[PDB]
Amino acid sequence: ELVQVLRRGLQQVSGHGGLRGYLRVLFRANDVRVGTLVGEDKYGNKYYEDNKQFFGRHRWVIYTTEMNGRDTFWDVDGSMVPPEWHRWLHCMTDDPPTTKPPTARKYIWTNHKFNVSGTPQQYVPYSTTRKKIQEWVPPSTPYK
Amino acid sequence: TYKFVNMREPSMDMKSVTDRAAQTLLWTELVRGLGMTLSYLFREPATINYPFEKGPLSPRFRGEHALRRYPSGEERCIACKLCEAVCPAQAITIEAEPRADGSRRTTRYDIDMTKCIYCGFCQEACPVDAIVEGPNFEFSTETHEELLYNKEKLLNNGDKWEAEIAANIQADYLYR
Amino acid sequence: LHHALIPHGKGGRSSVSGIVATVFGATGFLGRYVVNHLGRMGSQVIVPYRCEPYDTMHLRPMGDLGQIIFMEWNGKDKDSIRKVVEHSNVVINLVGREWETKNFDFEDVFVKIPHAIAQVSKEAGVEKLIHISHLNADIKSPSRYLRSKAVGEKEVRAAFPEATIIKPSDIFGREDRFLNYFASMRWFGGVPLISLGKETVKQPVYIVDVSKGIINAIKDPDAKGKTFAFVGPNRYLLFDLVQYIFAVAYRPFLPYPLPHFAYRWVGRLFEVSPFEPWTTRDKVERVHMSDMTLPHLPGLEDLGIQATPLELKAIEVLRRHRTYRWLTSEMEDVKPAKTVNI
Amino acid sequence: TRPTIRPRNDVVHKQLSAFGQYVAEILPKYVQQVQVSCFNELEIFIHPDGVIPVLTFLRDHTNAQFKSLADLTAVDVPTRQNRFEIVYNLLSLRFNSRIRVKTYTDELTPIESSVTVYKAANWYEREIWDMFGVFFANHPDLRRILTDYGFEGHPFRKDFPLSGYVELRYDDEVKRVVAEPVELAQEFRKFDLNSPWEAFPAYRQPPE
Amino acid sequence: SRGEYVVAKLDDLVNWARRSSLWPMTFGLACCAVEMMHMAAPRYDMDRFGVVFRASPRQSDVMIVAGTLTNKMAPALRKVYDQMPEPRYVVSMGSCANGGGYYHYSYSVVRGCDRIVPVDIYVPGCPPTAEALLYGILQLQRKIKREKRLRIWYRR
Amino acid sequence: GVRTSPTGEKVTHTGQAYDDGDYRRVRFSDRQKEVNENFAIDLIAEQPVSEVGSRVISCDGGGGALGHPRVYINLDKETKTGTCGYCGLQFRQPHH
Amino acid sequence: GTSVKPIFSRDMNEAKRRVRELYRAWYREVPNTVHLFQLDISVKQGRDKVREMFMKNAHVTDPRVVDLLVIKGKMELEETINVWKQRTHIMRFFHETEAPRPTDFLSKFYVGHDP
Amino acid sequence: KVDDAKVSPPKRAEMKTSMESLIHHFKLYTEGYQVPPGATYTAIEAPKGEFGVY
Amino acid sequence: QLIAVDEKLDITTLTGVPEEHIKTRKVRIFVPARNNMQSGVNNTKKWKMEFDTRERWENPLMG
């Protein structure tokens, strides 16, 4: 009945930490759904699921408000998800990194980086090869 | 074996004529269309909450390129130039020389991402699984030059995305 | 020549010309043409900008991949000038405003900034410096614009002895202030001219001519310490010039004389605009002042440039100011104006 | 031989050979050769002057009824004196068959337009004029179809470079799109792939 | 300073208004237009971000070059770009628009739309997914948020 | 093993670095230079040498089908070690 | 002999005739081309350009080649009259954005290795 | 795919295990297979009509 | 009908090639030499025509 729908909405606003948390999530993600916390990201992101939603809406992430150096309260993008949670979020696998951690290597980045385009840390292409032809160096002494 | 789509004749009895006259005067099929639109109005929309929600993908998905390493940290690429030869768009440029220890390694490995058609042929032709197409697809830039990857950029991509690339390969290498 | 800076190719978009140019004021009327001519040959152009990057967008398609680098700079900071002139062998100065702002007066943009640029470029080892002043620059000129131009020219020559100084006169083009300034006076209804414009002589020069002259001076090995004057091939009275301008635009020309004090009052009244002023007292002073004659200075002909007469390029600027009735009229329908040549 | 080899159909081969003999007998004035491919495709090599008759016959004869013009194109072989090879592909719905008609021409010899026989040919012929430069006589409206306005040369010719001769860019001084001689930041890398060992003995040529 | 605060607030308001209401011109060239349509599809629903298509260039704010730009067509693209009132933005989508892509070494293909018009955002892919184009649009929104026109106007 | 040039620019594993008088360094002003910090040569130099009691050893890089093509390395030379031409691993017989 | 087939003309006279008709048509079209396309060139400039274009192929002595050239010129004229061409297409005949390439030996030796 | 390593590439395990498979993979992904001389017109019923390749 | 053209064939005015790439170009007609690393002779059967080598330089970006 309609009364039960209103009660569900009241439970939704109650289950986000009160009115302030409800408003924060509404203005940060334009969604106020409540789901089971799959896990927490080292950079601050939180990953939730709800299998009762249809495919595509059954997994989501609340992004952190503080990334490496920038304020991400309003400026968020899909490039801030770490690779393991990237695999879990895009439904490439059913096992979260919490229960199926990736293999550990000493060359894998320990600190994820987002898209740094339009930023002094952007990639600038250059040639990785050395000089090909060496020119003759004239002697430093006079010839006469 | 065929069927007709518009070879039906209408009944000419008085009842059918009255029904068609009511259809014409009272616009029954227009109300049918209105009812269908109203029915669609009350359904759940298929929209997903991007970027907080993502569309499904597969381990076969072809995205940003990356150069992989062995578990010891040594690069897998041996400068065989098979990926450069098989590239339909000629987006790969490779230059190689013997290393200080005599290994066969590259000195230049460029992929023009504005030339690449993302066909995945390079990772099929690679005999050591060195060059792969990662799962990343959100790497839009603000300048053209940022999409001209050199060896350093691809090595950084591999080091950054290995945790997911290895898992994607493990789930699909038996289909290859 | 530092082998990487040796010319290669056929002088096209993807070629290497060996020129690394830092073009100050590249977001202006002359700056876009200079950058276009530099990037045509395959040069490395460094554009220092203090405005919004959006306003630099039109400069992006002028070069190949990586041949145009946009760098933030501040006029009052010398470290930024050093940062933008570290790796250049040519430094071109096109910084200049026609009016005074609350942060930058004429002396700041014409004396202090050029002197700082010259000093920093000399310290950094820049081989060639091109400076732009006005033909009518004079220490005792009634306009502070030309006084500042002369003082800055002297300062640049003192700080950079091998600097090439170029003195154009009333550059006209699509985005000019010269032709558009006269064409926009049609809105008031009457054209106010001091002494009816019968006591002023003008020698305007085409924008493409100035850009080609700058390029050739960069490529000229003997134009190091020279001073050039860029003028057109014909001299016109101000009255005849404005008459021809209105005839090309097919607008009714209604000239009337306005005394000097009245025009100065109008300029002062317009000067209080917080945005770009329509006209100023200094602009009025410069408009009604005869262009100087300097036969002892080299001209465009000594750089291999043949001056383009206004009669062949007036329609390309003044067709925008026509109505629909006369929009399609040909260029040879205007009966070119009278020229006072000698 | 069973699993990985394409099966054969000798009945269709016999039918196509018989019909090729039929067509060759009916029109000896123009037909120069008839061939049947190993994959059951019938080709008739004719004289250019018989382009209009033969096709018309193939379209109108009761036993031919080739009423569909599937395709029409040209092939450039610089080693031949007659450099261009015109190919017509015809489909007969009544007999569920396909035929190919081949003829030849060079740069300065026009070919009769078959718009009267097939209305589909019109655009096709324009393409042949646009891409190869073969003129078609009595064409109702012959002009470029695929190339840019004012484009010089015929790109599909073998001696035409892959990247052409000119390239387009916007110029701010003239405030318009201009064309300039072509320049490439990276030249197209030519590859030599032909193995020095013969692969198909059945196609070996006499040693001259 | 009070004036600096006022101009900063006005600049923020104008940037918010401009990035919140982006109207790309209804303009497609090749395969990438299909992915643009799928971005307009219910699944992604660009309209929920304030992004609507409009056919007239005079009523358009963004041009999305989705497809190969040929020599025969480049003047038309430049013409429709010039008729867009400012402020205007260009998003290059796909390999063909970015640098030519599969047809880079072609006699009739312009090697990148950036030779004709200035480009703000480059979206890689062949074709980029609707998610990738949405990411590019949001990056353009952030870039617009980064603009400060009134600030430099004041510091002048 | 990263190291900086006398100009202060990092030297890549390929050994490239712009010269002092090179103008191309201007492309790095107000931006950065992309340098990968994991040098493969050092990382393969840290690997220990495997000791196997046979003249011929087999190497596939590990992972079976996920490595490199399997090769056979002869270990008759006692002055040197058998190095894989694909992975760079070293093998030797028990000596002295 | 040589066993050749004509396109339109049997000898030089008819080919020169068709050339003259095409030149007449282009001469008449030039002022309209200047007016409609709003070109900044004069009618004299366009007519001189047409004359130069016609003179570029003055060495041809083959009636078939001349017939093909007349066909191409008629194609171009039909392209221009119907305003299928744009202002850029018309103005491409003048090469205003191309630097003059020198022809003497010394300048070619200076610029590069090409002859 | 057709069990003919001179036309279709072998499996990656066979390529990394067998000499013939590696040679065939190399030659197919560098030069490609040679097609016997001949001309064909193959047409199919694509959703837009008859789609053909000569 | 036959018109009996008596002049040498010349189609330069119809190819659309710029004159610079007609007068200043030199072509080579030759049978390619057998590659010395292989004993096969299949690449020495047909004649090849190829143009003279022109200038190639280094792109300032990406080399």
Ligand SMILES: CCCCCCCCCCCCCCCCC[C@@H](O)O[C@H](CO[C@H](O)CCCCCCCCCCCCCCC)COP(=O)(O)OCC[N+](C)(C)C
């Ligand atoms: C009598 C009045 C006459 C004039 C009236 C004019 C119209 C009234 C003004 C409208 C005010 C409404 C604008 C406020 C909306 C801001 C919403 C907020 O969320 O924006 C944030 C930041 O907001 C902006 O930075 C500032 C906006 C406004 C700041 C100053 C405006 C003050 C009003 C001054 C009005 C004076 C009018 C003067 C003329 C009379 C960042 O959001 P954004 O990143 O985008 O979206 C990310 C989406 N995610 C979260 C899902 C990922």
Ligand SMILES: NC(=O)C1=CN([C@@H]2O[C@H](COP(=O)(O)OP(=O)(O)OC[C@H]3O[C@@H](n4cnc5c(N)ncnc54)[C@H](OP(=O)(O)O)[C@@H]3O)[C@@H](O)[C@H]2O)C=CC1
């Ligand atoms: N008719 C003419 O044009 C006359 C021109 N003069 C000289 O020619 C030069 C360029 O002419 P023109 O293109 O018409 O001038 P413009 O007004 O069109 O632009 C000059 C450039 O100088 C920059 N600039 C101006 N002031 C400052 C400042 N305080 N700090 C940083 N940058 C500044 C502007 O950048 P921004 O947009 O960010 O403000 C602008 O891009 C000038 O030096 C001028 O003095 C010579 C005689 C003829």
Ligand SMILES: C=C(C)[C@H]1Cc2c(ccc3c2O[C@@H]2COc4cc(OC)c(OC)cc4[C@@H]2C3=O)O1
């Ligand atoms: C308006 C919304 C609902 C959708 C539909 C749509 C766009 C954007 C652009 C276009 C469009 O539809 C029209 C008509 O159908 C095709 C079909 C095309 O190829 C099948 C094609 O490729 C360029 C282009 C088009 C048009 C055009 O570009 O978003």
Ligand code: SF4
């Ligand atoms: S995906 Fe295809 S086009 Fe892209 S680099 Fe690999 S082989 Fe080349």
Ligand code: SF4
């Ligand atoms: S195919 Fe693999 S090993 Fe060979 S050059 Fe390419 S990336 Fe390196």
Ligand code: SF4
């Ligand atoms: S980039 Fe790929 S998908 Fe997009 S238009 Fe070009 S070929 Fe088509």
Ligand SMILES: [Zn+2]
């Ligand atoms: Zn190994």
